[PDB]
Design a binder for this molecule. Structure first.
Ligand SMILES: CCCn1cnc2c1c(=O)[nH]c(=O)n2C
Ligand SMILES: CCCn1cnc2c1c(=O)[nH]c(=O)n2C
Lengths: 114, 114
């Protein structure tokens, strides 16, 4: 059920999303900007291992289209994106190091939810 | 709606929870074993800042009582526990360093969901 705080909480989520896409974090956010193109990257097992792909452009479209009804739904998608990276790649891969840094940006600001 | 995979996914979640409570991680998991006793710790603003307290003993009771119906519900509570730590404490506090390490244990194993 919708709560009167959901619009303002979704604004905070949109602020976080804007930050994740901003130049400040681009050195480690770039692998998450668009859907993984498994074929182009030679990752021919990606869709056998990752059942629910997610990326920041998809989160942005869902925010713009008012798909997310509350902050928890938004956060589950952002976390799904990171989890897919931790599931598919070896833990010492540079893409995992980038994911951990971007997730730290996300989690610390999500925790500041007004 | 319940899925036939929910029991096995909840078993994986229970395995993670057991690991988080195990001696292997006790050096950094201990602040999360029981509900924050704000009065005992002198944290007299804790319940003004943290609207939804969560801790591993509460997660365990909810698992034992079949409160969680799926893995996503379990994961939201574990993540809520970490988020409360990131929201209340300064980011350089030792309890935050412990939270980050325990959350890394959680997220990497949650990502291995069968
Ligand atoms: C930097 C390696 C190519 N690459 C780009 N994006 C990626 C990857 C990858 O190997 N694994 C991933 O999960 N993603 C998101
Ligand atoms: C180690 C400091 C006391 N202490 C114990 N548990 C805590 C804290 C704290 O200051 N902040 C917390 O969030 N928790 C979970």
């Amino acid at each position: 059920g919708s709560h009167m705080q959901d619009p303002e909480q979704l604004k905070h989520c949109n602020g976080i999303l804007k930050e994740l896409l901003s130049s400040k974090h681009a050195a480690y956010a770039w692998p998450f900007y668009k859907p993984v193109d498994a074929s182009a990257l030679g990752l021919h097992d990606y869709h056998d291992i990752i059942k629910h792909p997610m990326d920041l452009s998809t989160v942005k479209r869902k925010m713009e289209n008012r798909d997310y009804r509350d902050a928890q739904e938004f956060a589950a998608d952002v976390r799904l994106m990171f989890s897919n990276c931790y599931k598919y790649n070896p833990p010492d891969h540079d893409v995992v190091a980038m994911a951990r840094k971007l997730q730290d940006v996300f989690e610390f600001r999500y925790a500041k939810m007004p």
